[PDB]
Amino acid sequence: AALDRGNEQLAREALGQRQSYQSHTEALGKSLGEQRALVEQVRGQLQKL
């Protein structure tokens, strides 16, 4: 609702603050997906072993 009432200036400031946290989400998000392969493959070894 920040953009409401046609006060876009307030919305721009809030959105700019959002991107700071988004970068962590992207950097953290990719790592979580990458780590999924590691846990699965090691478990595959254990089951086979």
């Binding site: 953009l3 919305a11 721009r12 959105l15 959002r18 991107q19």
Partner: protein, 43 residues
């Protein structure tokens, strides 16, 4: 103090004038393109 901080510059390379532009240049999209979805989604 001047001696020590310079070690950080070599040890940790500082942002370049290009990386000042990349962040700002992509920030324009990061604010406009993001707000472009805003001005279209919640239009």
């Amino acid at each position: 103090i001047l001696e020590l901080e310079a070690e950080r510059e070599l040890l940790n390379p500082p942002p370049s004038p290009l990386d000042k532009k990349f962040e700002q240049w992509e920030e324009q999209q990061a604010v406009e393109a993001t707000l472009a979805a805003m001005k279209a989604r919640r239009s």
